[PDB]
């Protein structure tokens, strides 16, 4: 499976180098 292309290693959140996005959450501090 290493030589077929598949990754037999465990793939975690930090291996899928997914591109980070941004919606309008995580408000600033005390802005009210």
């Amino acid at each position: 499976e290493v030589f077929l292309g598949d990754h037999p290693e465990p793939i975690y959140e930090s291996n899928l180098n997914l591109p980070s996005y941004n919606h309008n959450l995580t408000l600033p501090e005390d802005r009210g």
Partner: protein, 51 residues
């Protein structure tokens, strides 16, 4: 005393005499406090939905 009491009454029914201004800096704090609590609720909820 009629002069003084009604002068203060119609100088106060606008909102300027001391007694009504000692209960207004004591209730604006309560409203500010409730609003800060609302804001903190929304902040935590949205940063939870994110993760």
């Amino acid at each position: 005393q009629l002069v003084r009491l009604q002068t203060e009454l119609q100088m106060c029914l606008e909102g300027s005499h001391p007694e009504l201004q000692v209960y207004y800096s004591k209730i604006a704090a309560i409203r500010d406090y409730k609003l800060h609590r609302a804001y903190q609720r929304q902040k935590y909820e949205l940063s939870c939905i994110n993760t």
